[PDB]
Structure formats: C-alpha cells, structure tokens
C-alpha cells in the first residue's frame, strides 16, 4: 500500500452513501501508523477531506480523524513524546489536527442533519475523555452547539 492507495482509498469514500466504512478507516489508520515519517501529508489530506467532502459525509470525515487521531494519541502515551514541534511525529500530527478542529467541528455540526449532529456529540464526549484535543477547544464547540 502506498500513498496513492491512501488517496484512492480516501477518494473512494465519495461513492459511499453514508460516508462511513470501518474497513477503509482501518486501512487508513494502519497506513497512518506505518507512515508517520510522512504524517504531515496524511494529516492535511484528512484535514482537507473534512473541509471538502459532501454534507452527509462530514461525520465520517470526523470518524477518520478520530481513528487516526486516537491511534497517534495512543503512541505518544506509550512512547512519552511531545514533539509538538517536530515534523514526522505523532505529537506534531495531533497538534496539527488541533489547530483546525474547531473550524472543522463548526462546519460539520452545521451541515449535518439531526441524526449526524447527535453522533458528533458522541464524538465530542470521547475526545473530551481521551484527551485527544484541548478541552477548551471542545468546550467552545459544546457551548455553542450542544447545550
């Protein structure tokens, strides 16, 4: 599997009515765990995909972020690194996703229907409990959309 299959895999979420496929998210995530040396490229791709995908797909874009984000997060706690400043590191990738997560969340909650708006709330809970993103960022989101 090479980066073109990551792009192709990610491009194929567009033919899925739901925008959700656990097998393919598991492919992306396994790939993300094998190619941290190019995490910056993986990250802006999954960041940009959430900005550009259709409206009913925005939850699955945030599922892909949750899947890669929480596996990278499980590495920094097994490896005790906070290289938030070093490219090619799991610490950097989460730092990158965090700087844009609010803009992604405001847009994803905005363009979802009530069903998907609910599942985004479930996502805010896990991230709040996992420590994936700064709690202050999620609170700004929860205080304006889920309350």
């Amino acid at each position: 599997m090479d980066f073109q299959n990551f792009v192709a895999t990610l491009e194929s979420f567009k033919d899925l009515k739901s925008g959700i496929s656990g097998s393919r998210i598991k492919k992306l995530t396994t790939y993300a765990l094998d190619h941290i040396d190019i995490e910056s490229k993986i990250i802006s791709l999954i960041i940009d995909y959430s900005r550009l995908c259709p409206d009913s797909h925005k939850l699955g874009s945030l599922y892909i972020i949750d899947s890669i984000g929480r596996a990278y997060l499980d590495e920094t706690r097994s490896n005790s690194n906070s290289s938030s400043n070093k490219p090619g590191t799991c610490a950097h990738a989460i730092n990158t996703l965090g700087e844009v997560i609010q803009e992604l969340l405001s847009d994803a909650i905005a363009k979802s229907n009530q069903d998907h708006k609910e599942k985004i709330r479930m996502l805010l809970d896990i991230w709040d409990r996992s420590g994936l993103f700064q709690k202050s960022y999620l609170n700004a989101i929860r205080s304006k959309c889920f309350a």
């Binding site: 739901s18 656990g22 479930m122």
Partner: peptide, 7 residues
C-alpha cells in the same frame, strides 16, 4: 453497512 466502531 460497514460501520465505524466508536472505540
């Protein structure tokens, strides 16, 4: 439906 497991 191949869904995403929230875990």
């Amino acid at each position: 439906e191949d869904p995403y497991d929230l875990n």
